[PDB]
């Protein structure tokens, strides 16, 4: 889905970024306060 | 390192930090404008909130982390090192501190969705 498309499985580092992302999303930090 | 294969990271020289993502580094004598893999900060996919980019802080923020660093490392993923626009795709580490992490963790950027459909599709 996402209306985005890539073929390569780039997962390397995604989990690192996304834990850090998740922290900030819940914190409503700057951009995450768009919601 | 999560993966068994540790990805290729090499030191680079900082030329300038343009945006909070898009920066210009010189690796092994090659000056390229890099942007941070898995990060999307400067130009939004489509600025929906308008102030959805946080450009002023974001671009300053990158300067803070990179200019205070003695050692600046560019690590490349299994995607690509370089994109057709002549811009590099890397993770920038400041003495081992991944600047990409700081951006998203500070809520100044979003993770750039590298797309995995399911498998082949």
Swiss-Prot record, chain B:
Residues engaged in binding Ca(2+): 21, 40-41
Active site positions: 35, 43, 87
Subcellular location, record wording: Secreted
Name the UniProt record assigns to this protein: Nuclease A
